[PDB]
């Protein structure tokens, strides 16, 4: 069970750790988060009490190094950093734990929510979407644009999601225009799965990462990516049975976790209606269709 | 974006453009079967592809054989239209390729955009104009070449005959739309007006009669009267 210590908390802030969140007061004796489950990626996220503008945060995996948070009064944000000195880090964490200045990652033993939202998400894939190779953790915020958004402007601070465009030469084979536009199986199976992602696990990893950035930061481009990757599967007549069954589980847990109050800005009415009621896969997503009909009948 | 009354002069500028109307591509007769069920029989159709500046009409005849063994023909008809327009653009020298294609029905946008991905600089646009191009099959010489076709065929016409020798393309397009609107509203009455005087004939190389400027004014007035007479018969007003 790993620890992310905080040097201090000089500004009042709401702190997220995965699906959980805590209020910290200006200069509250808060020194971090302990008992973080090994084996999963995690996200630690921030919304300042005095400017709710820019939710921002850090994807990390405690297996990859010793990480801490320290407020930078110049740049005005909580920054993740790596401690290279293991003994110094162990000594810091031991002191803060002994003085009980840390919140405990509040996992219920029955509760598989975080595993279910991150099953296919790997830090190595996050670091290719979010490029900052000198750090082992990844910064994301509310305003970061995607490579696709940037084509339609600073390349270094972009989300390099896989570009999906249904009306693109990549998506449509010469002489199969109608076939490829109305049945996207070629695009899903040959171009994306075989060609770019190599396997369904990497595709689902990116879809799950896109959802979490949309939910935790209200990142609009991330929301567009999540819907495009759902729509590409639902618009394909030929999908492996194991991928459809897994997609139904992935979406069920995403719809289950979404705050009820953000359904209006995080769910695209056209995509969901098409996917559940018109698409090739309209009868393949039983769990997702049931939770959507019971939780968000207005959207449909 | 979309073409309307606000940007109407754009039709007659020096940027090459084509209108595409797909309303006569998939045509059927509905009839009773021996068992008293209903069935369709396809008849030959056409793509109506028109340069509104020059009058050049690219009439692609759609022979009933293209439907054989196909499903969802109303959907296929949009894609076959987009395929044939794409093939037509590719067949034209670069300096004759359109800069814009305006579809008369919004359902043609995605099929044509997908077929024209290779031409990212050709704008595919809808229109808010209600254009009467469905009435093309009321022009006897176009109806004849479509119904006689035994195989796919492209036939080239000038839908303005020699009018551009005497009038602008704005005026020629206005005359064409008024003639087609009349033919669409009351075909029998419109054709009566056009052919009631045997002394005015259709040249072998023309679609419409050889009216003098003064006779076109009389014809145009008779067509507006037909449209208003019919409108007061529809709506009881």
Residue A56: helix, strand or coil by DSSP? Answer: strand
Spatial separation of the C-alpha atoms in residues A110 and A165, rounded to whole Å: 40
If asked whether residues A161 and A118 sit together in one domain, one would say no
Determine the angle formed by the axes of helices A241-257 and A220-234, rounding to 10 degrees: 150
DSSP alpha helices (H): ranges in A119-258? 123-129, 147-151, 177-182, 185-186, 200-217, 220-234, 241-257
If asked whether residues A34 and A166 sit together in one domain, one would say no
Which residues have a C–N gap over 2.5 Å right after them in chain A? 152
Helix (H) or strand (E) segment spanning residue A101: none
Dihedral-angle region of residue B236 (phi above 0 means left; psi in -120 to 50 means alpha; beta otherwise): left
Q: State this model's resolution in angstroms.
A: 1.5
Contact at CB, B111 and A168, closer than 8 angstroms: no
Cβ atoms of residues A218 and A140 within 8 Å = no
Single out the residue in A99, A127, A143 at which a domain terminates. A143
Task: Give A-chain residues touching B82 at CB under 8 angstroms.
Answer: 177
Spatial separation of the C-alpha atoms in residues A171 and A183, rounded to whole Å: 11
Spatial separation of the C-alpha atoms in residues A162 and A86, rounded to whole Å: 37
If asked whether residues A229 and A283 sit together in one domain, one would say yes
| Full domain range(s) for residue A166 | 144-300
Contact at CB, B114 and A172, closer than 8 angstroms: yes
Spatial separation of the C-alpha atoms in residues B190 and B224, rounded to whole Å: 10
Structural domains for chain B: 9-163 (3.30.420.230), 164-237 (1.20.80.40)
Nearest Cα residue to A5 out of A32, A25, A26, A28: A32
Non-local (6+) Cβ contacts of A45 within 8 A are A15, A16, A17, A55, A56, A57, A58, A216, A217
Which chain A residues touch B if contact means CB-CB below 8 Å?
Answer: 167-169, 172, 177-178, 181-182
Spatial separation of the C-alpha atoms in residues A251 and A117, rounded to whole Å: 9
Spatial separation of the C-alpha atoms in residues A55 and A47, rounded to whole Å: 5
Dihedral-angle region of residue B12 (phi above 0 means left; psi in -120 to 50 means alpha; beta otherwise): alpha
Spatial separation of the C-alpha atoms in residues B118 and B121, rounded to whole Å: 9
Cβ atoms of residues B115 and B85 within 8 Å = yes
CA distance B63 to chain A (A): 20
If asked whether residues A130 and A251 sit together in one domain, one would say no
User: What tokens were used for B156?
Assistant: 């080239």
Strand pairing report for A20-24 and A32-36: unpaired
Nearest Cα residue to A229 out of A154, A131, A214: A214
Specify the CATH number for the domain of residue A15. Answer: 2.60.34.20
If asked whether residues A287 and A186 sit together in one domain, one would say yes
Spatial separation of the C-alpha atoms in residues A242 and A149, rounded to whole Å: 32
Residue A296: helix, strand or coil by DSSP? Answer: coil
Cβ atoms of residues B128 and B103 within 8 Å = no
Strand order from edge to edge, sheet including A20-24: A20-24, A13-17, A42-48, A56-60, A138-141
Task: Give A-chain residues touching B114 at CB under 8 angstroms.
Answer: 167, 172, 177-178, 181
**C-alpha angle A231/B118/B25, rounded to 5°?**
80
Nearest Cα residue to B1 out of B129, B131, B127: B127
Cβ atoms of residues B202 and B209 within 8 Å = yes
Buried b / exposed e along B58-71 (16+ C-beta atoms within 10 A): bbbbbbeebbeeee
Single out the residue in A84, A117, A143 at which a domain terminates. A143
If asked whether residues A117 and A166 sit together in one domain, one would say no
Please, what's the largest Cα pairwise distance for chain B? Answer: 59
Q: Spell out the long-range contacts of B165-168 with Cβ–Cβ below 8 A and sequence spacing 24 or more.
A: B166/B213, B168/B12
Determine the angle formed by the axes of helices A220-234 and A200-217, rounding to 10 degrees: 140
**C-alpha angle B4/B8/B13, rounded to 5°?**
140
Exposed (0-12), middle (13-18) or buried (19+): which is A27, by Cβ within 10 Å?
A: exposed
If asked whether residues A11 and A124 sit together in one domain, one would say yes
Task: Give B-chain residues touching A182 at CB under 8 angstroms.
Answer: 75
Strand order from edge to edge, sheet including B56-62: B123-125, B100-103, B17-21, B45-50, B56-62, B153-158
Spatial separation of the C-alpha atoms in residues B60 and B45, rounded to whole Å: 8
| Whole-angstrom Cα Rg for chain B | 19
Nearest Cα residue to A80 out of A43, A105, A28, A127: A43
C-alpha distances in Å from residue A230, one per residue of A117, A210, A211, A271: 15, 11, 11, 8
Nearest Cα residue to B98 out of B81, B86, B82: B86
If asked whether residues A215 and A160 sit together in one domain, one would say yes
- Residues forming a β-bridge with B158: B56
DSSP A279: S
For chain B, the three-class secondary structure string (H helix, E strand, C coil) is CCECHHHCHHHHCCCCEEEEECCCCCEEEEEECCCCCEEEEEECEEEEEECCCCCEEEEEEECHHHHCCCCCHHHHHHHHHHHHHHHHHHHCCHHHCCCEEEECCHHHHHHHHHHCCCCCCCEEECECCCCCHHHHHHCHHHHHHHHHCCCCEEEEEECCCCHHHCCCHHHHHHHHHHHHHHHHHCHHHHHHHHHCCCCCCECCCCCCECCCHHHHHHHHHHHHHHHHHHHHHHCCC
Q: Spell out the long-range contacts of A88-97 with Cβ–Cβ below 8 A and sequence spacing 24 or more.
A: A89/A5, A92/A5, A92/A68, A93/A3, A93/A5, A93/A32, A93/A34, A96/A3, A96/A5, A96/A31, A96/A32, A97/A3, A97/A34
Residue A2: helix, strand or coil by DSSP? Answer: strand
CA distance A278 to chain B (A): 16
**C-alpha angle A140/A142/A145, rounded to 5°?**
75
Cβ atoms of residues A16 and A58 within 8 Å = no
C-alpha distances in Å from residue A3, one per residue of A72, A92, B219: 20, 10, 90
Task: Count chain A–chain B contacts defined by CB atoms under 8 A.
Answer: 23
Single out the residue in A81, A108, A143 at which a domain terminates. A143
C-alpha distances in Å from residue B8, one per residue of A91, B11, B173: 77, 6, 11
Please, what's the largest Cα pairwise distance for chain A? Answer: 70
User: Residue A60 half-sphere exposure, CB side, CA atoms within 13 Å?
Assistant: 26
If asked whether residues A45 and A61 sit together in one domain, one would say yes
User: What tokens were used for A115?
Assistant: 């595993």
Specify the CATH number for the domain of residue A176. Answer: 1.25.40.550
C-alpha distances in Å from residue A103, one per residue of A34, A60, A97, B56: 6, 18, 9, 77
Contact at CB, A177 and B115, closer than 8 angstroms: yes
If asked whether residues A15 and A70 sit together in one domain, one would say yes
Non-local (6+) Cβ contacts of B51 within 8 A are B16, B17, B18, B57, B98
| CA B203 to mean position of chain CA atoms | 21
Spatial separation of the C-alpha atoms in residues A266 and A210, rounded to whole Å: 12
Count of beta carbons in the 10 Å neighbourhood of residue B162 = 13
If asked whether residues A49 and A8 sit together in one domain, one would say yes
If asked whether residues A169 and A132 sit together in one domain, one would say no
Query: How many domains are contained in chain A?
Result: 2
Cβ atoms of residues A45 and A216 within 8 Å = yes
Cβ atoms of residues A183 and A280 within 8 Å = yes
DSSP alpha helices (H): ranges in chain A? 86-98, 113-118, 123-129, 147-151, 177-182, 185-186, 200-217, 220-234, 241-257, 263-266, 269-273, 286-295
CA distance A127 to chain B (A): 33
Nearest Cα residue to A93 out of A6, A29, A9, A24: A6
φ, ψ for residue A141 (rounded to 5)? -145, 175
DSSP A163: P
């Amino acid at each position: 069970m790993n620890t992310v210590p905080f040097t201090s908390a000089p500004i009042e802030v709401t702190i997220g750790i995965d699906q959980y969140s805590f209020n910290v007061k200006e200069n509250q004796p808060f020194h971090g988060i302990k008992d973080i489950p090994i084996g999963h990626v995690h996200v630690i996220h921030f919304q300042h009490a005095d400017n709710s503008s820019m939710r921002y945060g850090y994807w990390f995996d405690c297996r990859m190094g010793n990480f801490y948070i320290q407020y930078d009064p110049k740049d005005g944000l909580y920054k993740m950093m790596e401690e290279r000195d293991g003994a110094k880090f162990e000594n810091i964490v031991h002191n803060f734990k002994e003085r009980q200045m840390m919140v405990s990652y509040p996992k219920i033993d029955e509760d598989d929510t975080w595993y279910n939202l991150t099953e296919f998400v790997q830090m190595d894939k996050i670091r290719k979407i979010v490029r900052k190779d000198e750090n082992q953790f990844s910064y994301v915020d509310s305003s970061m644009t995607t490579v696709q958004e940037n084509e339609l402007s600073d390349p270094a601070h972009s989300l390099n999601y896989t570009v999906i465009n249904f009306k693109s030469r990549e998506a449509i084979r010469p002489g199969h225009e109608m076939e490829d536009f109305l049945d996207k199986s070629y695009y899903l199976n040959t171009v994306m799965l075989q060609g770019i992602f190599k396997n369904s696990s990497n595709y689902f990893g990116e879809l799950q990462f896109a959802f979490l950035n949309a939910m935790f930061f209200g990142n609009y481009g991330s929301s567009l990516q999540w819907h495009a990757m759902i729509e590409l599967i639902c618009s394909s007549a030929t999908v492996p049975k194991h991928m459809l069954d897994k997609l139904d589980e992935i979406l069920y847990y995403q719809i289950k976790t979404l705050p009820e109050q953000y359904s209006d800005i995080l769910l695209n009415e056209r995509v969901w209606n098409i996917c559940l009621y018109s698409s090739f896969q309209k009868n393949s997503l039983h769990n997702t269709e049931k939770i959507m009909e019971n939780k968000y009948p207005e959207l449909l | 974006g979309a073409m309307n009354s606000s940007n109407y002069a754009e039709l007659f500028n020096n940027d090459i453009k084509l209108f595409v109307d797909d309303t006569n591509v998939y045509r059927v007769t509905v009839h009773k079967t021996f068992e008293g069920n209903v069935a369709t029989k396809a008849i030959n159709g056409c793509i109506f592809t028109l340069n509104p500046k020059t009058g050049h009409l690219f009439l692609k005849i759609i022979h009933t054989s293209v439907w054989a063994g196909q499903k969802r023909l109303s959907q296929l008809a949009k894609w076959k239209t987009a395929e044939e327009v794409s093939a037509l653009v590719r067949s034209l020298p670069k300096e004759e390729q359109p800069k814009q294609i305006i579809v008369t029905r919004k359902a043609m946008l995605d099929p044509l955009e997908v077929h024209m991905l290779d031409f990212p600089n050709i704008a595919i646009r809808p229109t808010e104009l209600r254009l009467p191009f469905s009435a093309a099959m009321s022009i006897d010489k176009l109806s004849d070449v479509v119904m006689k076709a035994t195989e796919p065929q492209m036939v080239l016409f000038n839908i303005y005959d020699d009018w551009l020798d005497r009038i602008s393309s704005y005026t020629a397009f206005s005359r064409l739309t008024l003639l087609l609107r009349a033919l669409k509203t009351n075909e029998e009455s419109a054709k009566m007006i056009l052919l009631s005087d045997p002394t005015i004939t259709i040249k072998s190389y023309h679609l419409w009669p050889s009216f003098t400027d003064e006779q076109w004014i009389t014809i145009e007035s008779q067509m507006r009267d037909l449209i208003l007479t019919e409108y007061g018969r529809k709506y009881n007003v």
